[PDB]
Design a protein around this nucleic acid. Sequence first.
RNA 1: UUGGGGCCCUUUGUUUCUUCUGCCUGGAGAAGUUUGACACCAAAUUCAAAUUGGUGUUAGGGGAGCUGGGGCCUUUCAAAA
RNA 2: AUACUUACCUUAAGAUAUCAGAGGAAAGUCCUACUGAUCAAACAUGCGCUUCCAAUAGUAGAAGGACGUUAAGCAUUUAUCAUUGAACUAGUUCAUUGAAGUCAUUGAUGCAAACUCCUUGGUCACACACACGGCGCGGAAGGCGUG
RNA 3: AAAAAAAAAAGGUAUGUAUUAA
Lengths: 186, 75, 74, 49, 196, 92, 101, 184, 119
Amino acid sequence: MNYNLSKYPDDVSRLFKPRPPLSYKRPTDYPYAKRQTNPNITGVANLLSTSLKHYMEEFPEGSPNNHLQRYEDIKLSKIKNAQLLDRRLQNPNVDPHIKDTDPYRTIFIGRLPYDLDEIELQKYFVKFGEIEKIRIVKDKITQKSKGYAFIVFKDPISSKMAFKEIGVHRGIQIKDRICIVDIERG
Amino acid sequence: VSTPELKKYMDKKILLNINGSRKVAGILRGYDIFLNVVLDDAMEINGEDPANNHQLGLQTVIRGNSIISLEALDA
Amino acid sequence: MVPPINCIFNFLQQQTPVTIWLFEQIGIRIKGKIVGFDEFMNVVIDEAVEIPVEKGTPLGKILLKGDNITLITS
Amino acid sequence: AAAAAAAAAAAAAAAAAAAAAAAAAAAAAAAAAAAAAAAAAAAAAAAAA
Amino acid sequence: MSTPAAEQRKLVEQLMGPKICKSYLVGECPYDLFQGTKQSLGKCPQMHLTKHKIQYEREVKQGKTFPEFEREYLAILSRFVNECNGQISVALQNLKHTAEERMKIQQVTEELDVLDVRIGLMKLQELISKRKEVAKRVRNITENVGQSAQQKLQVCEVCGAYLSRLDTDRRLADHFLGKIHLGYVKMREDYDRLMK
Amino acid sequence: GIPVKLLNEAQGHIVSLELTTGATYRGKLVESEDSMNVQLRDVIATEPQGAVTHMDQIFVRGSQIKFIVVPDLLKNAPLFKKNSSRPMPPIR
Amino acid sequence: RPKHELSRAELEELEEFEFKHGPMSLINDAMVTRTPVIISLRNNHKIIARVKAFDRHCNMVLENVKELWTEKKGKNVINRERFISKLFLRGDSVIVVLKTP
Amino acid sequence: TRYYCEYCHSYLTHDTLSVRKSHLVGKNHLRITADYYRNKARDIINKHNHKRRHIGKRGRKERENSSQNETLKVTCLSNKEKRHIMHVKKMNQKELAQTSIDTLKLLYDGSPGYSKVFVDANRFDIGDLVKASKLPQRANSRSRDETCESNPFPRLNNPKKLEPPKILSQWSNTIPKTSIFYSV
Amino acid sequence: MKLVNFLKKLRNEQVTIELKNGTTVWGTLQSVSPQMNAILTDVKLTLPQPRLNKLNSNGIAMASLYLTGGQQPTASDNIASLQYINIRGNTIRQIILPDSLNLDSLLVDQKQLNSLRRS
RNA sequence: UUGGGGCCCUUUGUUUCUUCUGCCUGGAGAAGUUUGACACCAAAUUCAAAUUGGUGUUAGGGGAGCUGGGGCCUUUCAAAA
RNA sequence: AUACUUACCUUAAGAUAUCAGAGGAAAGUCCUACUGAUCAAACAUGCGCUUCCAAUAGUAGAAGGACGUUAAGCAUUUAUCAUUGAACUAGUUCAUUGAAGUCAUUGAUGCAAACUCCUUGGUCACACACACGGCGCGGAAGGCGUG
RNA sequence: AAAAAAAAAAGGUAUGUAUUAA
Ligand SMILES: [Zn+2]
Ligand SMILES: [Zn+2]
Ligand SMILES: [Zn+2]
């Protein structure tokens, strides 16, 4: 081409030569100004609602929705979960596995191994002070240890020292497990 | 996302075709990302140049959806 | 430069009356006082009349969709 | 100088660009004069010793 | 930003929902100019809202014209004018010298004994003296061309950036049309606006 | 996508257009965006009914474009390499 | 508040609200109550049917569809009816949808 | 995102219309890309078609009719020869590519409208484009207004006589040996 | 919810895709894209005859139908049979799915449950 | 190793895997095969090499070894009837 | 390739088959080269699976083209609007003024034929063999199945 | 009885200037 207004030099520009001009074909379609979708849509008639009854008497009862029952199953199931949680929430001065002495001296151990023993926990808990009472949480249906316990100590200051020392660092190592520690929380 | 580049066009008298039939000529003022183009001293071109041509308003704005091609008759 | 919707905001506060052309299929053009607008260029027009294409009937305060907007002209 | 910078640059910024160019050239001339004065002072200091 | 309707909703919310800031009837603010350049950083105070801007620029037609905005706008701008002048001073301190004059002292040394020779022999004496001082001036010129070879340029007062004399104009146009230089150009003019 | 990148690769070369209105704009392509709206230089125009004119500059909306004809030698252009080996991107 | 600010779950609560409380609640209440609906498309003929499913775009899955379309040439009219058991309808064609009593 | 420019093979980070427009216009990218299409274009001429051969069983008739026809000798150049002759032929094709005989522009040089047509910078159709086609010219004429009033007499020791028509190098011995008249 | 995810479980079923042109496509269905791009295999696609004493059918759909290359010369009415048609999504109007399949099994979306089961 | 016959030689740059030698009264010989070699394109200088930037080629066939898969046969074992 | 100067600019988000069961850190989550089912991809590998793969016992033929000729082929239909004056029937011709005006009329539309030329194929092997509709070697394109 | 500090440039493209041989 002659001018080639481009980055390329003359030899590269003449290499990009386009195909010859497109031949003219008369349009077979509707001009853009004439283009529209179907106008004068007949609205929904009183005569259409009058013809509704032929459809209504033929199919009076719709097919049941069994894909909605899958959702009505799970939501009702959630409501029943909330009801069981309601059964648990109504149930610490009664419990008397928890009726041991003043809660200010009650220190809670958790994540203890289920194979653990009362002597070792008496030593690890006895490290921070003298032990007043001790109670280990076991399931009611069977004696398997739940992994948590409550230790009443002679003074609340020693119980707080045990919570901070034992519970504030890594958890206190007991048997093969790291055991978290906190206050009674109940 | 990206603004159309009319930057060389603005303030120059420009003809642009509204929809299929119409052709409007005016001095381009501003534009946006949808190519909505506002221009002043608008005139609607028709077959008879002095006769059927009638001005629109002091300021006219155009929806970018009805814009087909935009030619500047100017430098 | 004068962004177009800025210009429309200058149609809102300056209270200038505007004629607005719709798509070529409908066949009516609206005119009234543009009050406020949205990002979609659909505008509320106070004291609007619909003219077929001067005996047109008055509309009201009417929300007009931006999809059918072609021109907004003073 | 106008024909060289007029092609690529927009015409609206061509005026202020031109004025800034002339100002820069003037500053260059001033720096040259200052350097010449310093050279003269150095020559006088070399002649005094 | 992802879609045009979102950006356009952002712009329309800028159009339609003390704050001071932008002030003077022409553009400005210190911050808006330098965004994306190395110099200025991010969020800036108050709000340069097109609604407030249209209200104020329309009050220019109303002509209430109480340049309290300009009296805050000198406290804002002239500080940046002084900052740029200071950066100019720092650059002038940096550029001119280096290890530099060491070798130049060396050059002076190569001159010293030269310029001495005359006073020892005092026609051929003053001739050898003239050629000696000529060689000295040549050495000094070579040293100046060497320090220029390290840095040959003049710092523009406007943008505090360096401009070589040998790059002629057409390269300098890129520096003059940049955001930094053009912005500082406007801020200087704004200082002149506020001095009146 | 590759189809738009090929249109960006066609800048500065003679291209043809078909707008959905039926016209044909053949001429040199100056600018193109990712919205496919292009602007052309020194272009010959064919109206839908065949009347041909000439205009120096044109800008068209990408939504109204139907097909674009691009110089054939762009067929072997590197965009169409299936298995290609890029280096590692710079860390920023 | 724009949609790009919200998180992944806030969009789910938003769609749950729009279906439960909103315009499309006309269709939702029609799906649960087994009430037949009338739908006008832009193709200018109307289906009397029953909605088994619907969606944001308004595209909806139908059961016992009855399509009614009339045509006229030079003011000569004929009414045609076409029965379908189950159908899937793309939502861009519809314009008005009413809930029968 | 990031814009990978596969011509230069170098990434550019966070594509933007400004930076990408600057890279595409860049001189280095220009050379790289132009050379790339120079290679991809020279290949289609370089590549041999190598169309597949389909050999059928020669019939008894044409083997007898073709047996009486004597066998023709074939010529095959040496490798050292064929390399050189291929070089020469290719360089001849490159020559015929660039010829583009302009002699008409040399004929009308002194015409009254020569400045408005053949100068091609000052024209109408192509005139305005050449200005924008001028390179950015970073660092380091024939105006249209001419009239016939300049150069009133086209010959005053000014013009060179028209250049002789060329001749093929191969057949250059074909020329009539002697001219009909005595030139100076 | 995206109801298009329903169509993706309808794979390998006989279906009619009734387009905006009025063109109807009977065929075996293959993978449906998220944009509702529908790809079929063995298809017979045709146009209905409005009777109404010769009312001219769609003029664009006849041309588009002959230009598939699948219309055979000796077809008296207007039809075409071909293999592998790929249909853009926005062209679809109605989809008539078979009577045999049950919706209650297919209309359960796993994401809808997954959102509720997790909360 | 020689002779005879048949078909092919468009392999068109006379077997196209390179390079070098070479061929129709012949189908050949030498070197080489992927951190490499070769061909080609582009430049500006130097002034015919290289320099820098790019595109492409490094092939086909058979056999031995080793290894993956499949079908069939014989033997040994486990379960069931 | 290195150094300096100037300009232009910087991170949409998340994820990598599903379902179910058992286990580890009442609810939920995460995880198990854990167990099953289904799905998908790649790679192998099979089906008396389906279709196709050109004359030399001759100067052919099949598919697809010509943006090829005959060819001004044959048959049809088309060549601007407005204003003023003269004549004219009761629309027509000529002259002047203004506006736009793809080229074509050897055109465009319809109809049909003849000719010429391009690209493509296993131009393979065995066979010139009186049957009731096979079980040569490969290549191309599919469908189905196992691993 | 109580007490006291922080760790950082990034790197892409383009333009101009200088260097890399008889
Ligand atoms: Zn600010
Ligand atoms: Zn400066
Ligand atoms: Zn590049």
